[PDB]
Design a protein around this ligand. Sequence first.
Ligand SMILES: [Cl-]
Ligand SMILES: [Mg+2]
Lengths: 115, 115, 115, 115
Amino acid sequence: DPFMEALGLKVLHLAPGEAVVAGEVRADHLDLHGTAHGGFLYALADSAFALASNTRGPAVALSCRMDYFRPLGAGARVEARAVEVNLSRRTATYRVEVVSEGKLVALFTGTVFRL
Amino acid sequence: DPFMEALGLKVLHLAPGEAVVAGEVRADHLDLHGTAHGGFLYALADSAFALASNTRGPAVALSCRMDYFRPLGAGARVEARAVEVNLSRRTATYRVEVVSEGKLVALFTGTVFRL
Amino acid sequence: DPFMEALGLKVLHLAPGEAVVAGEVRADHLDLHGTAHGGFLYALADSAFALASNTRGPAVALSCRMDYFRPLGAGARVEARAVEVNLSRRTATYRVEVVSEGKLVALFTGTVFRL
Amino acid sequence: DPFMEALGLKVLHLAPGEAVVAGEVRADHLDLHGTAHGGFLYALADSAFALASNTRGPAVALSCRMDYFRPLGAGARVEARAVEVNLSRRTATYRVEVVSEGKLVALFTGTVFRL
Ligand SMILES: [Cl-]
Ligand SMILES: [Mg+2]
């Protein structure tokens, strides 16, 4: 995955219906506030979401939600843990918890269309 | 904005409560499908969202939704147009339309907490 | 629609990809705070959403988002105005504005899976 | 809660950061398809969401997401089980699972603004 690699993300866990992607907030991931850009944290969660969902077969995202709980400073290590919430014949939904220092710093919810 | 620059995004319009950010889907923005990664398109929309929201004063994102309508291939030019939907004293909501070739390819909805 | 009827909702306008549903905040629509229950406002928006999407053929709702901006008191007349944002072969997305006395009370965003 | 009462909903469990609300899909809860109206299921989840969040002090809902997985028929007994995902100084987020006959019917995600 080009974008994943470009962001320095690594797959730490992969299994049917699940995946964990980890990354560090680098200097090129900060925003106007000096903290982790919302797009970086989303990209992280979305990547885990893409991996987990596609273990069930080709799937494309339809709708995703991202809830942010605490701004992260440069150097933070973040992990996105994707778990399967629902698996239908044409769609599937996953929950992705974004964790840093053992606490949930963001919550991602996404649904895909199964090809 | 470091992440914005790292993704090759440019601000094309800025005004009270609004902003337009544009970018091109580069080789480092593709995903496992060979099309624009969901995180790239979100980062684009989120950047316009951040700019528009912060014209009203310091604001941080609370919850955002991204709805994807068509996968984009390498080289696509994309524009994220942010408009203010609601402005309250402690929160504000924006709609961000992602357009390519004159058509809406994604819809972003986000709410911020005003600092 | 039984639930619509039960809540006293009326279809004011219905055309390709759009619909307007109206209702009044009744005594049986209030929450403890004494204002319009979030579920009532959602039911109103969801009803317009359903009618607008049906104009394109049978479909089932997948994911919906409701953003609340202002509280409504008992007796308020309110409307849900749905418009089509995207129509694809397999899904469709609509925006629904909940309005009362000329003010935007809430914003509903929803996607359906076309059957 | 008037609206809760009107829909026949019952509070089964209420503890710090969590709540369980139960109800039955009645004749006045159906849509045209003859299945549980999306607004009824949302009202159920929203009610548990409200009760769970109130355990932390007064708060108003900002943004909520509802993901529908399975249709429910008339007479079905259903429950909304809310759990706290995040508690911050100014906001809080909850996950609410809508269950019937041991199956996950829908997933509700909501954030409140703490007063
Ligand atoms: Cl959402
Ligand atoms: Mg009644």
